[PDB]
Write a protein that binds this ligand. Structure first.
Ligand SMILES: Cn1nc(Nc2nc(N[C@@H](COC(=O)N3CCO[C@H](CN)C3)c3ccccc3)nc3[nH]ncc23)cc1C(C)(C)C
Ligand SMILES: Cn1nc(Nc2nc(N[C@@H](COC(=O)N3CCO[C@H](CN)C3)c3ccccc3)nc3[nH]ncc23)cc1C(C)(C)C
Ligand SMILES: [Cl-]
Lengths: 303, 302
């Protein structure tokens, strides 16, 4: 193990403080510098972080890896010391992606629906007592009764194809909701390469109502479950009854009896977000009752 | 776990049976078809494989993944049935690369020296009692004479920059021996390969090679450099080239200088041996096992 101590440059900053908390919960030694002590830094040192105030070269001493907010700025004395000694320096987006190596990672990709689907997954998993850490907008959150970031077995994260870290995710389950052309063939290849980062025992969850996902499906040499309203979708919504703030539908699933559910958000697109979620919940062994509870009690993204 | 049963079309092949053997050792259900039974299929059956003689669609029933030799032949009934059901069908090279995921994988890349370096690493790891499975030229081997492949935690494999799986390998340790001539794109491919290491992995880099030296600062992974270069972390000095045999002393961080020998001439074989020494040292292998493994190696394929 060539990573024992991880040093964050600007550990009090957004996205940085959650990553540090996860790494502390994975058992690593974590240190960090910041220009000002705050409630964020005082909470980090109660979790075991060594906090330095201000930037000076000595703050990097002993670190095996440095994490920086984005750009690598050799004008910063901690970064300059690390670079002079060939200590790796990585942006926070890459360390965030690296967390999936330690957890059962569920990556939610596609043009539209990533945030809502990530949130619905977290809600249904919490209703089943699985309490994942989930990542929306680069920020780590804890679902359910478990308050410790990264303590859960599960890590659910939006996967944005424009991020440099997109193709370095190592998920166990990957969803593609849709692929929207607003080079298109480079883009399709990017999504195909993303899905091939799954292990052979992993799962690709594919919306076949989307034309481009349907087009790339035969290229995916990984186990797949398809979903949609389409007559050939593995996991299919029928009997859709739109009723105000809430939509009722029946979900057909391989080797299961039909299940009547509802989602407390309007629009066909939220039936599709719920179907992705049901595929993932079903794969994880979550009960019908918890699926119903998590979809119908969902209070919205951010609530 | 969405892969319980792996089915090999043509499992009696020399390059298929070893992959099947490892998957059996990993606890998977394995089945395979071939045109005729053989000592190979019987060995696999004794390890737990279900063997079908003849090709028919039904041989693939229950499989989660099919493995074929290379090309996907939609005329084969087992392949056609799998494709109709969205069962993945993958060439053996891609299943071979995937084994690194289950093991402590050591990937040996670079334009020159991959086969010899992989072989020396296997020899030293065997001398250290670690019983490695290793891959050269697409062939799985193990040091143990009468052994099932994949028994040990260690998997050492050549990584060819021209293979479709090169950028999907998931090693714990990766060597780049040299990068020798678009060329700007080749550099990028080796840099991307090295970033497939976890942050707690290790990149072993020959700084005598000008292009490896050039890309070294781009590698945001822990690194150990080697070579004859004065600034190499792990350095060969005191080199005496005596017939087909070379003696040299290796300097390592935090260790006393160690005199070794290799019975293959040429400075490139000093470099192949240095890469091996870096990897063996990192793994905690003793001086005695390094000395024995290097000196006893008779040559690739011997
Ligand atoms: C929060 N939210 N959540 C969504 N969720 C999903 N939406 C879609 N589809 C979109 C239609 O999308 C396109 O019209 N596109 C995209 C493809 O490219 C096309 C140009 N070539 C253009 C959709 C919109 C409305 C009703 C039904 C389906 N499919 C999905 N599958 N699983 C989840 C899911 C969608 C949204 C919005 C749009 C409200 C932000
Ligand atoms: C079995 N084997 N094992 C090797 N191992 C290594 N070789 C090298 N460097 C090569 C660079 O060789 C070139 O670039 N050449 C040589 C051929 O003709 C090229 C025209 N383009 C120019 C080298 C060759 C000779 C002396 C010193 C260094 N560096 C290494 N680092 N760690 C291991 C290692 C090399 C070999 C070969 C196949 C060459 C015999
Ligand atoms: Cl955060």
């Amino acid at each position: 193990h060539h990573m024992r101590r991880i040093h964050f440059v600007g550990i009090g900053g957004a996205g940085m403080c959650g990553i540090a908390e996860v790494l502390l919960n994975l058992g690593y030694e974590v240190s960090g510098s910041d220009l000002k002590a705050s409630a964020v830094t005082e909470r980090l040192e109660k979790f075991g972080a060594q906090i330095f105030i201000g930037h000076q070269a000595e703050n990097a001493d002993g670190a095996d890896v440095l994490v920086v907010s984005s750009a690598i700025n050799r004008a910063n004395p901690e970064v300059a010391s690390a670079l002079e000694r060939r200590i790796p320096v990585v942006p926070r987006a890459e360390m965030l992606a690296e967390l999936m190596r330690y957890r059962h990672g569920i990556a939610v990709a596609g043009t539209h629906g990533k945030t809502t689907t990530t949130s619905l997954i977290a809600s249904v998993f919490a209703a089943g007592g699985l309490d994942p850490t989930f990542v929306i907008g680069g920020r780590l959150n804890a679902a359910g009764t478990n308050a410790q970031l990264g303590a859960s077995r599960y890590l659910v994260a939006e996967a944005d194809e424009s991020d440099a870290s997109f193709l370095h995710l190592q998920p166990m389950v990957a969803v593609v909701t849709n692929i929207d052309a607003d080079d298109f063939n480079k883009l399709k290849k990017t999504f195909v390469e993303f899905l091939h980062n799954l292990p052979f025992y992993g799962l690709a969850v594919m919306c076949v109502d989307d034309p481009v996902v349907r087009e790339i499906l035969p290229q995916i040499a990984r186990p797949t479950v398809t979903y949609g309203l389409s007559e050939d979708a593995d996991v299919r919504a029928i009997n859709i009854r739109q009723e105000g703030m809430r939509t009722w539908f029946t979900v057909l699933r391989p080797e299961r009896e039909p299940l009547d559910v509802s989602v407390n958000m309007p629009g066909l697109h939220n039936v599709l977000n719920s179907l992705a979620t049901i595929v993932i919940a079903t794969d994880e062994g979550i009960s019908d009752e918890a699926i119903v509870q998590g979809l119908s009690g969902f209070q919205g993204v951010g609530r």
